[PDB]
Amino acid sequence: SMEMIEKAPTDLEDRDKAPHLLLLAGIQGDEPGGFNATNLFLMHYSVLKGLVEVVPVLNKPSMLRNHRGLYGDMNRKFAALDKKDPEYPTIQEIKSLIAKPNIDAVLHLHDGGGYYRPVYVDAMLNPKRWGNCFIIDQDEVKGAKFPNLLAFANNTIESINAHLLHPIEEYHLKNTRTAQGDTEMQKALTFYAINQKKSAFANEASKELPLASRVFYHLQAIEGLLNQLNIPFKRDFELNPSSVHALINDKSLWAKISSLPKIPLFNLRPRLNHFPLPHNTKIPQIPIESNAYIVGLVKNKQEVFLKYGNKLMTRLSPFYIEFDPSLEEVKMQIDNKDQMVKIGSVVEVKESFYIHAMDNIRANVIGFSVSNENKPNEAGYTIRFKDFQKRFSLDKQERIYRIEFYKNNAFSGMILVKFV
Ligand SMILES: N[C@H](CCC[C@H](N)C(=O)O)C(=O)O
């Protein structure tokens, strides 16, 4: 369920004019710095020459359950691995990406407890900790396009250390010298990459940091490495923790579930009741689109959670039903003017709306009621904001309401009205 997304120049011909980086995060599902950094990179950066291939979350099932690894430690599965392991197919996908001839370098992002120090200081600051370090398996990889791992790492670290938020967050180099006997790292992703003659690096941001600070450091590491590779790029924001926080918590983010209208990710009520979902369909098979890359659905008891990374955006209490795709549009009067409103759209209303009757279709405006009928048809009513019971809104702001259409016990679609 992981996916690779390309960040490429507009002109295909420019792809071969600078190096190619494979950027990977989310091998552990409870390390949101890494997968929020890949998400922001995908949403807000442009690559002008060369290519950056991104797997924003390697372990998506585990991310959805805020779990380090549902099927074990995915980053110990790159050497010996039983074909029956549930993640065996995913590991082969990742290995195939790493080993492609077009890839020159690999950057793997993680979050880790404490702060790495080369010497022991205390329980939080010591050599067994991984927070805020930039990691190589060895100094050099003979046969790579860019064999000088140590020089790249030192220069990337220098770049990150020019932008520290507090001196305790200073980055240090960790060279695990993996081939010489680090049996754990011999099973990990970056060692596999070195063995395919790729330049491979890992960045670990401290779990002691708030998310926006972790993401800040991961973005510094990405930029530092891109600069070393001479992959030119732009971003549409200033790289500081306040801007990172604003971009993670962006009110323009949305999720489109199945053929339903887009809903905002943020400021939803915590529970959406009687929420139509296609019947006879496993939750991971329900289509979901977003302008973010780390959104999904997951079952929890009798609810379906909408997830944005590790963040719970709402709890759907599903109404499983056949989705009949026959209805494409509905005639509505909006602020006195008829228009044909597409099923699955959001229509802004300043004053009022009225749904024209349809022969075999009933409309239920959720939050509007004329009687206590259990299958209402609310076509033919002129409806204003003041007619709604506000607690039925999708949003905490009480402006967005669902209109659901039904045809003979099947669901014919939804339109949202947004009062502006
Ligand atoms: N804290 C991570 C570091 C892995 C660093 C590098 N070997 C990689 O594969 O990215 C781990 O213990 O899996």
Give CA–CA dist 393/166, Å, rounded.
43
Q: Is 76 in the pocket of ligand 1 (CB under 6 A)?
A: no
Do 152 and 228 contact (CB within 8 A), yes or no?
Answer: yes
Q: 82: exposed, middle or buried (C-beta count within 10 Å: 0-12, 13-18, 19+)?
A: exposed
Ligand 1 center from residue 317 Cα (angstroms): 38
Give CA–CA dist 237/249, Å, rounded.
14
> What is the number of the ligand 1 atom nearest to the C-alpha of 202?
10
Do 363 and 383 contact (CB within 8 A), yes or no?
Answer: no
CA distances from 221 to 130, 157, 164, 171 (A): 15, 8, 12, 10
Output the DSSP codes for 31-98.
Answer: -HHHHHHHHHHHHHEEE-SSEEEEES-S-HHHHHTT-S-BTB-GGG-SSS--TTSTTHHHHHHHHHHH
Q: 202: exposed, middle or buried (C-beta count within 10 Å: 0-12, 13-18, 19+)?
A: buried
Query: Residue 191 belongs to what H/E stretch?
Result: helix 189-195
Residues near 418 by Cβ (< 8 Å), separated by ≥ 6? 346, 347, 348, 349, 399, 400, 401
Ligand 1 center from residue 264 Cα (angstroms): 35
> From the annotation, which residues make up the binding site for Zn(2+)?
28, 31, 44, 110, 139-140, 163, 236, 340
CA distances from 124 to 195, 207, 208 (A): 33, 11, 9
Paired with 264 in beta bridges are 254
Copy the structure tokens of residue 342: 């597409």
Do 307 and 253 contact (CB within 8 A), yes or no?
Answer: no
Report the structure determination method. X-ray
Nearest alpha-carbon partner for 206 in 148, 131, 261, 260: 131
End-to-end Cα distance, the chain: 38
Amino acid found at 366: I
Residue nearest to atom 11 of ligand 1 (CA): 75
Ligand 1 center from residue 132 Cα (angstroms): 13
Residues near 68 by Cβ (< 8 Å), separated by ≥ 6? 28, 29, 30, 31, 62
Edge-first strand order for the sheet with 295-300 is: 271-278, 311-321, 303-308, 295-300
Residue pointed to by tokens 């494409």: 328
Nearest alpha-carbon partner for 187 in 75, 325, 312, 26: 75
Ligand 1 center from residue 168 Cα (angstroms): 22
* Residue of 28, 94, 135, 192 to test ligand 1 pocket, by largest number of atoms within 8 Å of CB: 135
HEC readout, 121-174: CCCCEECCCCCCEEEECCCCCCCCCCCCHHHHHHHHHHHHHCCCCCHHHCCEEE
Resolution (A): 1.4
Q: Is 204 in the pocket of ligand 1 (CB under 6 A)?
A: yes
Residues near 151 by Cβ (< 8 Å), separated by ≥ 6? none
Do 104 and 21 contact (CB within 8 A), yes or no?
Answer: yes
